[PDB]
Amino acid sequence: AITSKKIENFSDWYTQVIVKSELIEYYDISGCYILRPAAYYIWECVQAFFNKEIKKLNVENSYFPLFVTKNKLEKEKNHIEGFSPEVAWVTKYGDSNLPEEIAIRPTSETIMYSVFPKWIRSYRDLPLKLNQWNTVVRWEFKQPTPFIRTREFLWQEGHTAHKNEEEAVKLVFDILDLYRRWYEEYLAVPIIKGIKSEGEKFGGANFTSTAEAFISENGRAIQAATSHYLGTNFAKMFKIEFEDENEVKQYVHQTSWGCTTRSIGIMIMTHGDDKGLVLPPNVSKYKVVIVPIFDENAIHSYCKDIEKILKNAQINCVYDDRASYSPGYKFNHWELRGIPIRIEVGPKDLQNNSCVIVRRDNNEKCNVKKESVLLETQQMLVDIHKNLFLKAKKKLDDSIVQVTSFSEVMNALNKKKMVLAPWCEDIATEEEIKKETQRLSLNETTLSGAMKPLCIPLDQPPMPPNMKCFWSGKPAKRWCLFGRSY
Amino acid sequence: AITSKKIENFSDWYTQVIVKSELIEYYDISGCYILRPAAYYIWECVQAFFNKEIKKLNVENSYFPLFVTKNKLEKEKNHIEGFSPEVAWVTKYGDSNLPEEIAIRPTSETIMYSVFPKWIRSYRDLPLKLNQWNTVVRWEFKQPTPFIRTREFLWQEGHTAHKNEEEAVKLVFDILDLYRRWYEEYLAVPIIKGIKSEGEKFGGANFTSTAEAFISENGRAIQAATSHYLGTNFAKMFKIEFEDENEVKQYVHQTSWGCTTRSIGIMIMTHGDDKGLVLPPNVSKYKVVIVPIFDENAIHSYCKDIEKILKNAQINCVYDDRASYSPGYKFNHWELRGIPIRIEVGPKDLQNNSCVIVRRDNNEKCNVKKESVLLETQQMLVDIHKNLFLKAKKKLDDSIVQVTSFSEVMNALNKKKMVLAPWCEDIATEEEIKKETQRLSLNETTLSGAMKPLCIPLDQPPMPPNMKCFWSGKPAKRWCLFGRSY
Ligand SMILES: Cc1cc(N2CC[C@@](C#N)(C3CC3)C2=O)cc(NC(=O)Cc2ccccc2)n1
């Protein structure tokens, strides 16, 4: 059983759920986690979706080396200043020192763009559109969180190069909406699109667009995915020039974008409850578990009939016919593992040519005739997804408090909210705001009390004529979301 | 153009083909290579096939960490003795030394089996069946070869644990036949199944079964895939015990198996010719390229009609309508890249409601009426695969010389053959044979002249009553394939 309540001890709840549902195994290197089959299956689902969608944009998958030389790694100025203390270095093979130490990729801009100039010489070579499915390493000494913040993680990283700004920026936002769909249609998680503040954008980017999620039970925002307009910054550093149709040398305009197995953690944190994992049907291997209750051969034959009915309509299920466990053990076993639907069959159900169908998300039960099971299961799978999404969306909406003064912020943070505030967007105020909110959090978590700029939402409320910045008192430019975060 | 002939300067031919066909880009770390989209597409095809097939055996995909501790890495005795001098070690993050240095996986037995004992406690937990799609690192200082022998490579590694020997061994050979199908049905490459000699089997294995391929143009064998029966050797080292139905503690019987992007290199070396890449249709993104020859709008409309006909029947193609290049440039451009079929359309073809269809593998051309194109393309794609396979199979068969005495070996090796020889299988003769054949190769390649035991073929000729070992003169046990190798 899960022995900590989600609302009472969130972190212990989370670790219990991910271990006991067999998603995650811990490892003897801190910040590294094993993805067991149930977790990797979710990854494969979203991988298939995203592959299908980026193929329509003519992005092609590729694979680049795990390692980068000092030479290539330092061509980036703001980029390496961002990543340098968490880049892991290989220095030895066996007991012998390498002739030159080499670094493991934290992200692959410097690796890929080292060869982009050979591939791009003319406007005819554009656009160039690549993606990798790989793992990267960011070896930090902050507290890790399984799925959410790890030292090694699986992701996809896309990289494109275009003849001008307009085409690149359009691709940036097309990708951002694909991430919206990845979260909503497969994980049933709502996100907020926005632009990062200057202090929080990717090193080397012109701007960083972002999808933000929020975990209302512990008041913490989590960046769900990211899509950068790099402009010509990397093209200047790596000399990625092309001859345009007027025979003029130009720099390419670049994008890069990423989304990780953090998405799985966001889904777990969003939908999981005190009984364990709750899976949206689109990322659940088994849509239905059939559990018999005890003639035992009549029940066996009936449950296998139902299994045939579901599998014949391409609905994968499992009939838990294990002889040594009670029905209630099985109920709990499969609720912990997040199976969306349980079908129960006892003798009274068989006599009625009926069965009991039980939704994982709200535990509502109903009697369904045998011949109606297929249809009723299909409808229910759809309705479960919608319910999960809508419940999460209400929580997301209820997590935002609009403020005009810093005097309202701490109260909102302590109620596990984010704030939407008018802001002048000056980069120095970012650190000032972080430090003051951290200082004032003195009035249970292990994570920091500091509030960060999360994103400037694409959907802006009107800015009244003379509204001042909630922090500096200077004229406010736009509304920006702030909160504590992972 | 390819400027070296396959038969005259094989290595320069190979490097030209893989670069100019845009499969591979070289990198500023030796032995590491970029897989450009055309190469990665082949990987994705065989990945999809193998996933589908291992799912039928109830193998589940997973993902384990890139890194392993000294602790876990040394529990293996023969395994670490095998891998230790080519294990790469991470010792630093940024400029700070790690508190404990950690190793990059050369293969994941020690990583996965460190946690197997927590997952396997009862006969109810068996069999356990896992697979990973990942990359591994084997940092050797021998000469690398793109695709064939690299310091980092993509692969799949499967690992299973069973209640007894019979079940494990059956899975070993089921996997070996899946590798046979991977090579034959997608890459059109024939292989030879066999068992490794004791000197060549995997460190820690009970036995190693193998699929061997042979490149007749330079006389070199290449191991195509591998499937190990590990017995209880790793179970003893990692204490993977389970309670059986008689309540007796037993060790699991384990398997592990692997197949890499080396398969792509084998395909290139097998089917490539003096014009460049030759792709089996099942791993070619474009099955057909349509090339116009010059009313230009009539030809454009006709070629697009044909493109619609092919794409409507789920046959991906490309219409090369680029205005600045001649037809012959385009012919060569797409032959270099291995497209299986070229359709040419000039005015005489349009007047005849016809077109010219040209096979990449033998350059045979024929006139096909418009309404017959779909059908004729389908048949031709099938026939191209069969032809590629059968041609390769003839070469493989012609590459084996049966000998009874060492006196016949060097002659055969110099004619770019392998030898099938009666052998006593004593492990010390392996090094003796290697050293003597290397010594005698004195009478152009950069690779070693040494001959190795390749495999003991599953399909054995009869062993005559008193046949002696071709090397030691002692009684021969079985026939074994020997040759030079990659
Ligand atoms: C699993 C995961 C994800 C992500 N990040 C980042 C932003 C981003 C987004 N959106 C990426 C661009 C795509 C994301 O998902 C980041 C991470 N580790 C780290 O920062 C390193 C680390 C390790 C231990 C403790 C603290 C920090 N770990």
Ligand SMILES: Cc1cc(N2CC[C@@](C#N)(C3CC3)C2=O)cc(NC(=O)Cc2ccccc2)n1
């Ligand atoms: C691309 C590839 C493949 C394979 N091997 C091995 C046997 C096997 C088979 N069958 C694996 C078990 C599955 C295979 O494919 C091995 C390798 N590198 C190496 O030995 C390291 C190396 C690096 C530079 C020069 C020389 C050697 N590189």
